[PDB]
Write an enzyme that holds these catalytic residues in place. Structure first.
Site, PDB file in Angstrom:
ATOM      1  CG  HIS A 195      85.059  27.003  20.592  1.00 21.47           C
ATOM      2  ND1 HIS A 195      86.065  27.331  19.661  1.00 21.47           N
ATOM      3  CD2 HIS A 195      85.619  24.998  19.651  1.00 21.47           C
ATOM      4  CE1 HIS A 195      86.481  26.762  18.832  1.00 21.47           C
ATOM      5  NE2 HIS A 195      86.639  25.330  18.373  1.00 21.47           N
ATOM      6  CD  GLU A 225      93.831  30.522  15.683  1.00 20.49           C
ATOM      7  OE1 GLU A 225      94.909  30.028  16.261  1.00 20.49           O
ATOM      8  OE2 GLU A 225      94.533  32.370  15.292  1.00 20.49           O
ATOM      9  CG  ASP A 271      82.781  24.270  21.659  1.00 26.93           C
ATOM     10  OD1 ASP A 271      82.512  25.640  21.250  1.00 26.93           O
ATOM     11  OD2 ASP A 271      83.524  23.758  21.329  1.00 26.93           O
TER      12      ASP A 271
END
Lengths: 572, 572
Positions: free
Chosen positions: B281, B346, B227
C-alpha cells in the site's frame, strides 16, 4: 503550492509524467491533455453529428465573454436567462478556490434561434443545434450556436460551456480554438422519475436535480407526487387530501413551489410531467371520504405489494369528482406538460374482492369475481378517470400507464389504444411483452428494472437482507442498456427512457448520490445511442462526475481519482 | 399550517390517530409518544445501567438553560467548550424552520467531573457517567451529570440532550421530568476507519464525521492517511512525498489542518489515530527515491490486490530514515493518540521476488525464495519499522496490524507478541483465525468484512458488475454482528470494533451516506452489546437517522417516513 506533474497523450491515454524544468516542450495540464487525447474530449453526452474539436486551445479572459441574441421573439425571457446563466457554466471549468488570470482573448457568443416564438414541450419538438467556434480577428473568438428552437439553443450553450478547460499548471482558462459541431438527440423523451411520496424531497433539491439534468441534456422530470404513504401535492379544491395526507405541514408542494419548479425546468429545457398514480398506490389523505378500500389492511402481505395497503373504490361516483378536481389543480400549475401520467401500477384483486360495496356492484353488472371481472372494473375506472383527465387539461393529450395486467399486449386493445396511451416499461429488455406491445403499434418509455431502477441495492426496509431488486446497478449497466437493441425495427416507437428513483429508501439527503452520475449514462445512451460500450465512455464518464461535484452535486464516486489521473492503469 | 394528527401508545407502538376537537384527553405529538412508548425512548445508544425515564415531560424555556461546572481543573477549556456546545445539541430536537415558544421551566445543568485534570486517551480510560434529572423548586429543573473523567462527562451531556423533545402540535420544547441514568461502554475502542488516500476528503467533512461520531458516543477516528494512490499527509521532513504524492496541491492535510482535526476530536471524546500502511500500500510520493518496487507494475493482476501496484523495498537502509521522519511528523500533530496503526496489509511475494536488489539481499542472508523466506523479509521490515515508530512517539505504545499471512496465529509468536501488537480483524466472525489468536492472548479490533466494510455493494471500479465484497451491508447486519458472540470467553481481549470506509468509491461527497446511520448500529452494539436483535432497536434507529439529518448529515434513508409515523405497519 504548485502542480508538479504534466500529462502526455499516448495511445488514447493521458500519461502522468514529471514536469521536468529542463524541457523545451510546453507542459500540458490533465484536462488539456484529455480534451484532445480523447475521441470526444471532455464532452458529455458526445454529439451525434459533426464532432470536430480541432487541435488547439486558446487562452480566454473570463470577464470578456459576451453573449448576443440575434433573433428576438416570444422566448426572449428564456434566451436572456439562458445567456446570463452561461458564465456560471463556464466557471465550472475552474476548481473551487482556484482563480484564473484575467488575460487572453475575448469571446463573442452568438445565439441564432430560428424560431424565436416556440416554447412548447412536445414529442416532436426540435432539439437540434449547430455549434461553430473559430478565431475572430486577433484578440477574440466567434462562438455561434444555430438552432431551430430555444431548446436546441440552450443545449448548444451546454455543449459550448464544456469546451472550456482550466490549466491549473499556469492558472489559465482555456477554450477549444476550432470547433465544428452538429447535434440532435436520438430520443425525444429522456427522463428521471422522482418519487416524492414515499419520502419528501425539498424543492431546493428538486431544482438542483433539474440543474444536473440540464447539464447532460435530460429533458423530462417525471414527478411521482402521490402514493400510499403521503399526499404532499397541494390541491386547493380538495384540501383535506394534503392536510390529512402530508407527512407534516411543511412537507408539501404548494402551487407557488410547483410553479417555481416548472418555470425553473422550462428555462433549462426540462418538462415537468406530473403523475397521479391510480387506482392502486393511494392511501394517506383519503381518510374520512370512504373512497378507498384496504387502507392499512392487515396482514399487508395478502392485499398489496408494500405497506400500507390501499386502493380507490371505483364504484363510488363521487371518486371521479375528486379526481377531476385533483387533475384540474395539477393542470393549473403543471402548465408546461404535454403529457399526463396516470400510473396504472398493478391493482390488487384481493383488495377489491374484500369490499362489500364492490361485490354488490359487480353482482348488479353481471360480473363474477373471476378476475376477468376485476380487470373489467379496472378498465371501468381508467375510462372514467381518463375522461376527467381530458376535461382537466382542456384537451386530449397523451397518457402514460405502466406495464401491468391491464396493459398486457394480449388484451390491451380491449381497453386502450396506441394513439391515446404511452406505456412505461419496467420489465427486462428481453421480456416478451415488449415485442408484443411494439407489434401492436404502442409507444414505449424504457425503465427496465434490471438497468434503470436507481433504488436497487440497499438494505431491506421491511425485514432484513437487501431490497427487492438488488444488486445495485452500476453506471456500466445503465450505459449498455440499449432501447434500440430492445426494440429493433420498431425503435421509432421507443420515445426514450427514464431512470426511476423510487423513494422508500431515498429522500432529500440521498438524492444527489442516487441519481448522479448514473443518470448521465442514461443521458448519453438516449442522446446518442452509441454502438460502442461503456469502456469507450469511461474516461469521459469520470470527467462528468467531477463536473457534477463542481456544480455542488454530491455525486457518487466511481473510481479513485488516481485512475482519472492515470488513464489505462485501472482496468479488468 | 397545523399538525392534524396525534399519536397514542398501544402495545409498544405509537398509533396515528386523528386529533379530534371533541376530546378531554391532551394530544401527544409523535416524539412525545415515542419517548415513553419505547423501552428506551429516543435514546441512542441505550444506556447499560439505570434507564429510568419516568412518565412525564416538562415544558422548557430554550433561553433559560444554564450549564454549571462544579469541579475545576486542567480540562477547564474542554468542559467549557463542551458546555457551550450543549444548547446547540438541544436545538436539534427542534425541526428546521420551526420555532419553540419561549416559556416554561429553567434548566440548571450541573457538571461534576471527579478527576478534572485527566484528558488522556487510553484503553483504560473511564467513560462512565451518571445522569439524574428531577424538578427543582417550582420553576426549574436539576440536571446533574457525574463522571470520573471529562470523557464520561461529555458522553453524559450527549445523553442529556437526547431527553428533549419538540411538540410540533403546540410548538413546545419539552424535556423528560424524572430521569435516573447510569451508563458505561462495554468496549473501550469504538471506531471508524476513514481512508483518505484512495480519494481525498475535505477537512470540513472529516470534522462533520467527528460530530456525528460524538453524537452516538463513538470514540476513535482511524485515519488511513496514506496508500498507493496518494500521499496527502504533509511531512515537513520528507516534503517530496506529499509534493509528488498528493492528488493536487490543495488535496493535502497540513500540520495546521491535522491539529484542528485532532483538537476538534479531543473536545468531543474522539481519539484521532493515524495509520501509515507499510510495506504494501505504497506508491505515489516515492518516485525518485528508489525505495519502492513494482510501482505501476503491469499486468497489475500478477503483482497486487488492486492497481496501482507498489511496495517498500525493505533492503534499503535509507528507507528507515524516511519512515522515522514520517512517523515523527505524524507523532507531532497526532499528539492525542495512545496507539499507532502500522497497517500490515497483505504483502505481495511476486512483487518482492521481481526485484534484483531484494533477491541479492536474500542470497547473502542465506534465505531462499521459498516464501518462508519472504515472510522472514516482512518480519525483518516490521521489526525495523517498529523500532522507528517507538523512537518517533518517544515511548513504547501499542501498535496495530491487520490479520494477514504475517499475523496467522500459527506463527504470529515468531514475530510479534500480544503485549506490543493489537490485531485488527477483517475476516468473518466464524473464521478459525479469531479463536486461534484469542487463545494466544492477542487483543482484537473487529472489522469483519461481512458486517463492517461500509464500502461494499456498489458498482465495479475495475471492469463491470459490482465491487468485490458486495452485497451492500444493511444496518440490520451491522447491528447483529456481536464481538461477544465471536469471542466468547475471551471477550475481554476484544477491545471493540471499527466500521471501515475504504475509499476507492467514496470521497467528500459520499461520506455522510456511507457512514450514517449504519455506524450508529455499530455504536450501540459496541456501547451496549445488547442481547436483543435489530428489530428491538428499529424504532430508535429510525429516530437517530432523523437526528443526524437535523445535524446537517446527509444520512442514508432506511424506510419511508410513513413507517416512522406508523410503527408496526412496516414489517417482514
Amino acid at each position: 503550492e504548485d502542480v508538479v506533474w504534466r500529462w502526455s497523450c499516448d495511445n488514447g491515454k493521458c500519461v502522468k509524467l514529471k514536469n521536468d524544468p529542463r524541457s523545451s516542450e510546453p507542459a500540458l495540464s490533465l484536462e488539456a491533455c484529455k480534451m484532445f487525447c480523447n475521441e470526444y474530449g471532455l464532452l458529455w453526452p458526445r454529439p451525434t453529428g459533426e464532432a470536430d474539436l480541432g487541435n488547439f486551445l486558446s487562452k480566454i479572459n473570463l470577464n470578456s465573454i459576451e453573449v448576443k441574441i440575434l433573433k428576438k421573439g416570444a422566448t426572449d425571457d428564456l434566451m436572456e436567462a439562458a445567456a446570463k446563466r452561461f458564465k456560471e457554466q463556464v466557471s465550472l471549468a475552474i476548481p473551487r478556490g482556484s482563480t484564473p488570470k484575467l488575460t487572453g482573448k475575448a469571446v463573442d457568443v452568438y445565439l441564432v434561434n430560428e424560431n424565436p416564438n416556440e416554447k412548447a414541450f412536445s414529442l416532436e419538438m426540435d432539439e437540434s443545434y449547430g455549434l461553430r467556434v473559430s478565431p475572430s480577428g486577433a484578440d477574440r473568438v466567434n462562438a455561434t450556436i444555430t438552432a431551430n428552437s430555444f431548446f436546441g439553443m440552450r443545449h448548444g450553450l451546454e455543449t459550448l460551456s464544456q469546451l472550456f478547460v482550466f490549466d491549473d499548471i499556469r492558472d489559465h482558462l482555456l477554450m477549444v480554438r476550432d470547433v465544428n459541431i452538429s447535434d440532435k438527440p436520438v430520443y425525444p423523451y429522456r427522463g428521471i422519475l422522482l418519487d416524492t411520496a414515499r419520502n419528501y424531497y425539498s424543492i431546493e433539491s428538486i431544482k438542483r436535480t433539474i440543474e444536473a439534468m440540464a447539464a447532460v441534456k435530460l429533458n423530462t422530470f417525471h414527478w411521482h407526487i402521490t402514493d400510499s404513504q403521503s399526499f404532499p401535492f397541494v390541491t386547493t379544491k380538495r384540501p383535506n387530501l394534503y392536510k390529512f395526507g402530508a407527512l407534516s405541514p411543511q412537507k408539501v408542494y404548494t402551487k407557488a413551489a410547483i410553479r417555481e419548479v416548472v418555470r425553473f425546468g422550462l428555462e433549462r429545457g426540462v418538462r415537468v410531467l406530473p403523475e397521479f398514480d391510480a387506482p392502486a398506490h393511494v392511501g394517506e389523505g383519503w381518510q374520512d371520504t370512504d373512497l378507498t378500500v384496504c387502507f392499512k389492511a392487515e396482514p399487508w402481505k395478502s392485499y398489496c405489494v408494500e405497506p400500507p395497503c390501499g386502493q380507490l373504490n371505483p364504484t363510488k361516483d363521487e371518486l371521479y369528482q375528486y379526481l377531476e378536481d385533483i387533475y384540474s389543480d395539477m393542470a393549473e400549475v403543471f402548465d408546461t406538460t404535454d403529457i399526463f401520467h396516470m400510473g396504472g401500477d398493478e391493482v390488487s384483486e384481493a383488495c377489491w374482492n374484500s369490499s362489500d360495496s364492490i361485490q354488490n356492484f359487480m353482482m348488479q353488472n353481471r360480473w363474477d369475481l373471476d378476475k376477468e371481472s376485476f380487470l373489467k372494473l379496472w378498465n371501468y375506472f381508467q375510462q372514467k378517470a381518463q375522461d376527467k383527465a381530458y376535461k382537466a387539461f382542456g384537451k386530449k393529450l397523451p397518457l402514460i400507464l405502466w406495464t401491468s395486467t391491464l396493459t398486457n399486449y394480449k388484451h390491451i386493445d380491449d381497453y386502450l389504444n396506441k394513439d391515446d396511451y404511452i406505456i412505461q416499461v419496467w420489465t427486462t429488455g428481453v421480456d416478451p411483452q415488449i415485442k408484443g406491445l411494439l407489434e401492436k403499434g404502442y409507444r414505449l418509455i424504457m425503465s427496465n428494472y434490471d438497468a434503470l431502477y436507481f433504488d436497487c441495492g440497499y438494505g431491506a426496509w421491511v425485514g432484513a437482507g437487501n431490497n427487492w431488486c438488488s444488486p445495485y446497478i452500476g453506471w456500466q449497466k445503465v450505459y449498455d442498456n440499449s432501447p434500440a437493441v430492445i426494440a429493433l425495427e420498431h425503435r421509432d416507437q421507443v420515445l426514450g427512457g427514464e431512470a426511476a428513483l423510487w423513494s422508500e429508501q431515498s429522500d432529500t439527503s440521498t438524492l444527489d448520490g442516487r441519481l448522479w452520475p448514473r443518470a448521465a449514462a442514461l443521458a448519453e445512451r438516449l442522446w446518442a445511442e452509441p454502438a460502442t460500450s461503456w469502456q469507450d465512455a469511461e474516461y469521459r464518464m469520470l470527467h462528468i462526475r467531477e463536473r457534477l461535484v463542481r456544480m455542488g452535486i454530491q455525486a457518487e464516486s466511481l473510481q479513485p481519482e488516481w485512475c482519472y489521473q492515470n488513464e489505462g492503469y485501472c482496468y479488468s
